[PDB]
Write an enzyme that holds these catalytic residues in place. Structure first.
Site, PDB file in Angstrom:
ATOM      1  N   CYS A  80      26.804   8.977  99.178  1.00  0.00           N
ATOM      2  CA  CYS A  80      25.707   9.628  98.468  1.00  0.00           C
ATOM      3  C   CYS A  80      26.183  10.239  97.134  1.00  0.00           C
ATOM      4  O   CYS A  80      27.221  10.898  97.077  1.00  0.00           O
ATOM      5  CB  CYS A  80      25.106  10.702  99.382  1.00  0.00           C
ATOM      6  N   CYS A 122      54.339  27.134  78.902  1.00  0.00           N
ATOM      7  CA  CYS A 122      54.885  27.074  77.551  1.00  0.00           C
ATOM      8  C   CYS A 122      56.360  26.693  77.498  1.00  0.00           C
ATOM      9  O   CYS A 122      57.177  27.252  78.215  1.00  0.00           O
ATOM     10  CB  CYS A 122      54.682  28.412  76.829  1.00  0.00           C
ATOM     11  N   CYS A 155      55.501   4.969 116.755  1.00  0.00           N
ATOM     12  CA  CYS A 155      55.590   5.266 115.329  1.00  0.00           C
ATOM     13  C   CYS A 155      54.254   5.804 114.818  1.00  0.00           C
ATOM     14  O   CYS A 155      54.218   6.589 113.868  1.00  0.00           O
ATOM     15  CB  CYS A 155      56.018   4.021 114.545  1.00  0.00           C
ATOM     16  N   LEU A 163      52.659  29.748  83.099  1.00  0.00           N
ATOM     17  CA  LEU A 163      54.032  29.530  82.659  1.00  0.00           C
ATOM     18  C   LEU A 163      54.327  28.107  82.178  1.00  0.00           C
ATOM     19  O   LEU A 163      55.413  27.579  82.420  1.00  0.00           O
ATOM     20  CB  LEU A 163      54.977  29.899  83.806  1.00  0.00           C
ATOM     21  N   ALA A 189      -4.798  -0.139 120.348  1.00  0.00           N
ATOM     22  CA  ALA A 189      -4.002   0.823 119.591  1.00  0.00           C
ATOM     23  C   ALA A 189      -4.558   0.923 118.180  1.00  0.00           C
ATOM     24  O   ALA A 189      -3.825   0.819 117.195  1.00  0.00           O
ATOM     25  CB  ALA A 189      -2.547   0.371 119.554  1.00  0.00           C
ATOM     26  N   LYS A 238      39.670  30.591  81.627  1.00  0.00           N
ATOM     27  CA  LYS A 238      40.485  29.474  81.183  1.00  0.00           C
ATOM     28  C   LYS A 238      41.653  30.226  80.535  1.00  0.00           C
ATOM     29  O   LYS A 238      41.448  31.310  79.989  1.00  0.00           O
ATOM     30  CB  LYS A 238      39.710  28.662  80.140  1.00  0.00           C
ATOM     31  N   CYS A 276      51.529  -3.422 113.323  1.00  0.00           N
ATOM     32  CA  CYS A 276      52.714  -3.378 114.178  1.00  0.00           C
ATOM     33  C   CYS A 276      53.572  -4.619 113.930  1.00  0.00           C
ATOM     34  O   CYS A 276      54.796  -4.555 113.995  1.00  0.00           O
ATOM     35  CB  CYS A 276      52.336  -3.310 115.660  1.00  0.00           C
ATOM     36  N   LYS A 320      51.524  31.807  87.972  1.00  0.00           N
ATOM     37  CA  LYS A 320      51.065  30.492  88.408  1.00  0.00           C
ATOM     38  C   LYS A 320      52.254  29.543  88.336  1.00  0.00           C
ATOM     39  O   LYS A 320      52.809  29.294  87.263  1.00  0.00           O
ATOM     40  CB  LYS A 320      49.914  29.979  87.541  1.00  0.00           C
TER      41      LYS A 320
END
Ligand code: SF4
EC number: 1.3.1.2
Lengths: 1017, 1016
Positions: free
Chosen positions: A78, A670, A988, A668, A436, A573, A962, A708
């Site tokens: 959707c 930069c 596995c 951080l 009906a 931001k 497999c 961050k």
């Protein structure tokens, strides 16, 4: 010694059906092919004109029914459109976009709540709505080859899960206490008829606070046509009971055996008795009749739909009545007259009664059939014969029995009119005839009981189409009785519409006004009372969901709308000092290629080469002041970034703090002073630089701040610890993962910027990096116990959010999920989290995984019959095997008819929490106990795969996986295409991981000897 | 100063339709809803009984047609089953699993090659096969709610793209030169009738090497019923021409105006003229007739399907004939008699000729209809009326024209014996009558020409069902004429079947034997001749695809099968010295949750907590010796791991080298140290350790070796450089990304091991980590130019593989794509890579992106009418707008009719390479030129989004994304639901990224002043 790199005979045999590219074209004669085709046949055979036995078979025949696997796929498909046309096309205006979004996020409770808020008969409608003429008819995806969304099936699925949760509906929370309600709400209200219209009307009135609502029902059973005529094989009776009980939770009373009729209940007796308002929802109680059938009895073989369907319903619907009713004995050829839903349900029901053949006779042409294609399809697939352009003239009766019906030809002329050709007749043999044609209101005693309301030219109660009010101000009407529509959902809407105006009327009678704008309450349950607030770093969050510093927080006006929508917190931001002003390039944000060429909803990731905010610090600081002034309880965190300079970080952090920000988030990203030691290029990749920066900010402000962290480091814990040592109050984990999303076939990148079609490494976000973020959060939580963590990275649902909380995070940041949708997802996240926490207190639902019920053996989402004569027969759902299954099932139905039993109903009783409902603080870090080193994992407690034959769809993927990625331990039968895991399985788990059917394959404790394959001694 | 955090009036207005959760239930009356519903209506209205004007409208009406967007979606959905039932249910045994897998990987050439290898009329069949009674009828996905796969549409799509490529078919490569072929292959072969049966038979005989094949066709046109009767709106004539030209590329000759008939061509004249074998594929040339229609003429309004359909075809199919001809004038009510494909095509075709009304009359009931449900669906949707249980008795003619047909009622009794009720009649008014009862073979002169072959009880040529041979050994027959089947694909199969036995017969006549096992050749084109070999570190790879050290290389027997399948190289699962033996736990490999609750094919990732091989070094070394002995041209690289110990690395590396390994791959996942020197716990995360390990190995062996790098490091370049300094011959980038795939709602992990339900961090693999691997490869390639790189990380197609080659890698390792499927994907990767390289030499296809044609404006994969009265009209495909579009299109069709003209299909002509076809070495590193720093990106050359209204499906996702994640720059119309990008667009590109329609939104150079928004 043996050729080690060669398969021995046994293995070569097991690999017989393993895919191998052919070096030549294949040779198979046309005759050989015609023969082989029958063995693999899945769908109906066009050349087979004989129907599959259906006597006493009331199994679900709806093509729209969905199981969880199928529902999740369709919900994800959707587009979750804006101003959705499907919703505009739904008579109850269901917010389809929102409920399907919730299903896609596994939040079945939220989906059901949305559904029931606008439609109290949400489950019934999901099952019976003629969607092709309603919601689905307006679906945008009709414009794609794959087609429109199965809205009805999704609605049914979410509602069924909610039903299984056994949670009750509760009184409107924000409503004053029952005792403090104005006297007007105690006004005696009466509704006539317990069908969809009255159930809906009573439900909404109860939501508004009315405490004295009584529905008077003529019959001993409730539910109206949903109970008395719609077949059990389309609408299970337990669905009706479920919705009635939900209404009763609101205090609505129902009294059966009471009829609106001249010598019984009348508008006059109700008014004399003190009732202040009445709603007429008695539908059309009588059958449309034809003079030619006058005098014919059931013993002779004649029935009107009003006689027939209720007989079948009483016999097939456990509970409906107190007495067990026999199934009508319909033998021979059956003629059904009509072209609407009634006719088609009579035809299909006749087969359940033992009919040998059924003819549907229409007075018009095929093109003029009234029922939607979906309904017609059910009769068609069961081989009912359609006879157009015929009008009944006479019923030949011999020996006291109908032996045939004589008809005359009909035809449309040169204006459109319909005529009957007398010289053109048809003598159709038949043993039973069922009219009906439809229904009407014709009981003089019932009409008289409605005095003195005005009746229109159609001889039906006249009502204002907007208010549903009759000529008498205190009397309203809705549903079939009004004669405007003929669907459950429209009848539900009539009751809904009427409830608001009944409310307006009653309040006015007590001298009180109501809002100019209609304000019907939503649907509520105890889940809505669950507290999802959380405290972190001294800050109080109303809910743990917030917007990450990103595109969704490009402008403060967007944050404002996010808070209005309900988001707990938001990051601005990232912004900086004026001297660090930046300019973005374009294009800069692209879709991920992490899950193939799948476009539209649910992109698995995005890559961006966006810089920090292009808006000034001045803008952001004034914006924060504004936001905090208007939304004091919503947390605002200012994200900031400076170069590696003490004065700069102190200046900017102080400016942000002075604006009123609750906390700061240090970006951080930069670059530093001159590379050199392999600590990347960004400050956030060097523990020493991170520690220093945090020390500078700690010295500058008193509010909490979080560093961050970037996931692009060898040891993120080293950076987290550095931030803590520096004075950070917590850390946000994590930022984007560095990467390149891809190149076009000509070698050019995307995004491609400028004439040179250039690009640079970007940041990957979304569900594709969730594994990385989850690892980061858990590792930091284990290394630094109690240190606040704000999680970010692929959070797109309450379920995924809970995973991060369990991993040690306190709050959850979101970006990509919003880019994939809009801010309204917060509603899904909140109701979803409340439901997950609530369910943890329900002892009888411990087998569920969150909101997902334990997976049961199904095929196409329908329960696999647990018949002794089927379990272990190796009968797949195709070819001759399917024929055998059908024979066995038919025999079981006949046995059930013989071995009679039916009254062990289920006195529906809500589950009650048996332990406190967990608060967010109670779930944080709970998953950490299971995490450790590889050495802490037991290599003695091994498992093997086990396949549920009944759920298998015979694709052989487990076998192929497999074979070319495993231990060649699965046998794939050449005739049945059924897989069997052998003793060579090593557990596995790859087969289970590639199987298309959820839980078809399960891993179980190994019981046989276990020895690693060393290949040699 | 204004309130900065609030939207101004203008923006509030633009956000009008933006989603907002409601705090109450909505109130809308039932009456209001009934009215509003019509405005948004997409599908057919059940209450509308009047059909859309279709006069002279031959636009494609197939519901199965797919565009690229839709085809990729459906191909990804396919389970790609083992011993697939769909293939078993296909008369030509097409390898559906393989061709759909190829489509899913965007390798349309590979898909088409697979299709045509088993069915030379692959495009025609994709379009007309009654799939629900064939391949689709056996599809395993029928067992799911979403249903079976649209196999026909996928086949059609892949074949259409190949057609667009204009690539010719070529003679089987591995066949001796024309000149060196045995004389038996020059045997004169004759085929009668140019329909599907003969086209198929001739094609396969040509593939086998026969050089003198002639098809004699009675008519002036070729293609049989595909041309003369199947409607243009179901099967475009250019499709037929395309397949005929492919056959002609093999030298097959077609001579028109030649009939198998007494006095013309007969089996005797052919034998007399020296023909060695003959195939009869003339079909059923005559209409099945009814005595009651005797004498009726077309002028009176009577036609047999054999008269009517060809008339419509000649008028609507440009290129069929040379004469421009008017469409039959069908006016009034039309009665079509029949219940098979013929009747339904006559009914739909009648509407194109101007019929006011069409009645389909059946002798039996609705349940007895012969045509498959999708065929019936076409007539039904166009409002044709169905009248069951009627048998024709009389035709009434007045004023020289039919005015009515009188029928009698029919009914089945106790013994199924259908009876006719004389006293029960029907007088049906009609102006035109078309009998579509079927076809037969009745020409005495044609049957005589077949002397002396035996005819069966059905008066048709008798043939052995396995060999297709008639009573005369040199004569074979297939298709409709044998009377066994009535489908294009079965007729194609008859010719295919016959070709092998005709070959067997001819060879025997020349005293030569043939293989006991049938060996019909595959389909080939020049693309198959493309060289995809590559040299790296002194090693020669036959192709760049190999198996990574992983689950697919658990056992050497698996590597053997991979080489047999065609993989260029393979890595052994990592092994070590005996003292480092490990034991795996279970469960240990789980599906990724990186793309939601999507199960089955195409998992976007996997997470594993598997250790190195549990098999011994002795096993692996002996295995390598065996593998290299049996597959000398396939590269085998031994993956090994040791703790940080010089003696161990030297011992193990020498052991692997002595086994005959072509090279070694050093797994650097083994721990060392405490863990905070900022370089993790694994040797592979520390440059110093990596440099020392490589030094030890370089000193121990002479063969090339590569260091497998982990992406779990701050600077992977530093590790790559350390490996190079240590002596490594290259690096493998990269291993798995560490992560935690998820937790259940109760907090337990998955995988969960033991009663304790414990887990540990695992490695993520698959398409989800491709961005990380691609970044790693590019970074290393730019920092260490020329240093060999073996790429690994989400490679699952030739297209993705080419991305890595362009990024600097020489070879490509694969794991997850095989776990998601099987070893046969190598076939898709190789044909796909060949096609991508080949296409780079085709000048006329420069606008394509790899194998994807430039995207053209479409709706549901069907081309949008480039009409003037439609462009810029803001008419979406729903409600009253759709009504409007239909009116405009109908008017256009009528206009085109008046202007009786056009006919230039400009004969099909193959594209020829105009430059050398690039070798792998020619593309390696070519994308690096575009990579650089952010500063190197122009912030002056900005773009804006532009939406193609004609492709839009009105979902508003672009609108919602710009509103809550952008710049509120899109206006979404409240009535048409059509979006318009305004001047405030910043070109962030998010809208384009979330749009469900490929290329509906495009980024274009900004033409108006750009000013970054500063917040003020
Ligand atoms: S996301 Fe695409 S299909 Fe949807 S309304 Fe925007 S241009 Fe149209």
């Amino acid at each position: 010694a043996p050729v080690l790199s060669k398969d021995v005979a046994d293995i070569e045999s097991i690999l017989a059906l393993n895919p191998r590219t052919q070096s030549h074209a294949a040779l198979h004669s046309t005759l050989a092919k015609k023969l082989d085709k029958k063995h693999w046949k899945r769908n109906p055979d066009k050349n087979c004109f004989h129907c599959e036995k259906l006597e006493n078979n009331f199994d679900d025949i709806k093509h729209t029914t969905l199981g969880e696997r199928g529902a999740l796929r369709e919900a994800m498909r959707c587009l979750k459109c804006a101003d959705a046309p499907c919703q505009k096309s739904c008579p109850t205006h269901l917010d389809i976009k929102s409920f399907i979004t919730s299903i896609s996020n596994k939040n079945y409770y939220g989906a059901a709540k949305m559904i029931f808020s606008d439609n109290p008969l949400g489950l019934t409608c999901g099952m019976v709505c003629p969607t092709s003429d309603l919601c689905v008819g307006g679906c945008n995806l009709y414009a794609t080859e794959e087609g429109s969304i199965n809205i009805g099936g999704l609605q049914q699925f979410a509602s069924e899960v909610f039903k299984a949760m056994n949670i009750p509906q509760i009184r409107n929370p924000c409503l004053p206490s029952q005792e403090k309600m104005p006297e007007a709400y105690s006004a005696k209200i009466a509704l006539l008829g317990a069908g969809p219209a009255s159930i809906s009307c009573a439900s909404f009135l109860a939501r508004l606070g009315y405490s004295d609502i009584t529905i008077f029902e003529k019959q001993e059973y409730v539910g109206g046509l949903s109970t008395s005529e719609i077949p059990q094989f389309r609408l299970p009776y337990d669905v009706v009971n479920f919705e009635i009980e939900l209404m009763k939770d609101l205090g609505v009373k129902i009294i059966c055996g009471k009829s609106l009729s001249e010598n019984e209940i009348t508008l006059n007796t109700l008014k004399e008795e003190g009732y202040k308002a009445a709603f007429i929802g008695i539908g059309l109680p009588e059958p449309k009749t034809d003079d030619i059938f006058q005098g014919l009895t059931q013993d002779q073989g004649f029935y009107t739909s009003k006689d027939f369907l209720p007989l079948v319903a009483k016999s097939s619907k456990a509970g409906m009545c107190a007495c067990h009713s026999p199934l009508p004995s319909i033998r021979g050829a059956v003629i059904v007259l009509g072209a609407g839903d009634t006719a088609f349900d009579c035809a299909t029901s006749a087969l359940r009664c033992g009919a040998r053949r059924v003819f549907l006779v229409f007075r018009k042409g095929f093109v003029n059939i009234r029922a939607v294609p979906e309904e017609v399809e059910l009769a068609k697939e069961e081989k009912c014969e359609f006879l157009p352009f015929l009008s009944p003239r006479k019923v030949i009766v011999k020996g006291g029995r109908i032996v045939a019906v004589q008809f005359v030809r009909t035809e449309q002329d040169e204006t459109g009119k319909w005529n009957e050709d007398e010289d053109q007749i048809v003598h159709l043999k038949a043993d039973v005839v069922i009219s009906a044609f439809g229904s009407v209101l014709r009981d003089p005693k019932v009409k008289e009981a409605l005095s003195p309301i005005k009746f229109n030219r159609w001889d039906l109660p006249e009502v204002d189409p907007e208010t549903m009010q009759t000529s008498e101000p205190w009397v309203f009407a809705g549903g079939d009785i009004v004669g405007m529509a003929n669907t459950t959902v429209e009848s539900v809407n009539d009751g809904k519409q009427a409830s608001w105006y009944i409310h307006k009327y009653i309040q006015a009678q007590y001298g009180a006004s109501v809002s100019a704008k209609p304000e019907l309450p939503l649907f509520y349950t105890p889940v809505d009372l669950v507290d999802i607030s959380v405290e972190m770093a001294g800050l109080k969050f109303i809910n743990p969901f917030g917007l990450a510093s990103a595109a969704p927080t490009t402008s403060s006006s967007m944050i404002r709308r996010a808070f209005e929508a309900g988001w707990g917190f938001a990051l601005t931001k990232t912004f900086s000092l004026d001297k660090d002003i930046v300019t973005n390039v374009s294009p800069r944000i692209v879709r991920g290629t992490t899950s193939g060429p799948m476009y539209g909803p649910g992109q698995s990731s995005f890559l961006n080469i966006e810089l920090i905010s292009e808006k000034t610090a001045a803008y952001w600081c004034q914006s924060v002041t504004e936001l905090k002034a208007d939304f004091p309880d919503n947390i605002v965190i200012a994200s900031i970034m400076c170069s590696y300079n003490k004065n700069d970080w102190m200046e900017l952090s102080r400016k942000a703090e002075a604006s009123g920000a609750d906390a700061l988030e240090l970006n951080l990203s930069c670059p530093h002073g001159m590379g050199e030691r392999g600590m990347g290029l960004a400050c956030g990749q060097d523990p020493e630089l991170v520690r220093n920066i945090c020390r500078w900010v700690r010295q500058a402000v008193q509010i909490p701040f979080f560093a961050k962290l970037t996931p692009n480091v060898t040891d993120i814990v080293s950076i987290a610890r550095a931030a803590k040592e520096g004075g950070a109050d917590g850390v946000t984990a994590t930022n984007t993962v560095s990467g390149l999303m891809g190149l076009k076939a000509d070698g050019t990148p995307w995004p491609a910027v400028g004439a040179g079609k250039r690009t640079t490494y970007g940041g990957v976000s979304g569900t594709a990096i969730r594994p990385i973020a989850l690892r980061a959060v858990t590792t930091i939580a284990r290394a630094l116990p109690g240190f606040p963590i704000l999680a970010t990275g692929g959070i797109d649902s309450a379920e995924s959010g809970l995973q991060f909380l369990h991993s040690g995070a306190s709050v959850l940041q979101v970006c990509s999920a919003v880019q994939n949708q809009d801010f309204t997802v917060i509603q899904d996240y909140c109701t979803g989290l409340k439901a997950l926490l609530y369910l943890k207190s329900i002892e009888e639902l411990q087998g569920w995984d969150g909101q997902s019920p334990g997976t049961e053996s199904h095929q196409k989402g329908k329960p696999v019959p647990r018949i002794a004569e089927l379990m272990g027969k190796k009968l797949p759902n195709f070819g001759p095997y399917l024929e055998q299954r059908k024979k066995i099932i038919a025999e079981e139905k006949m046995r059930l008819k013989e071995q009679n039993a039916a009254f062990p109903p289920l006195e529906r009783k809500p589950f009650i929490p048996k332990k406190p409902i967990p608060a967010i603080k109670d779930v944080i870090g709970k998953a950490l106990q299971y995490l450790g080193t590889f050495g802490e994992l037991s290599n003695i407690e091994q498992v093997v795969a086990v396949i549920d034959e009944e759920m298998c769809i015979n694709c052989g993927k487990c076998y192929m996986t497999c074979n070319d990625s495993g231990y060649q331990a699965i046998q794939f039968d050449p005739e049945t295409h059924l897989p069997t895991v052998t003793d060579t399985c090593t557990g596995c788990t790859l087969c289970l991981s590639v199987c298309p059917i959820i839980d078809c394959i399960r891993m179980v404790s190994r019981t046989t000897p276990y020895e690693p394959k060393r290949g040699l001694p």
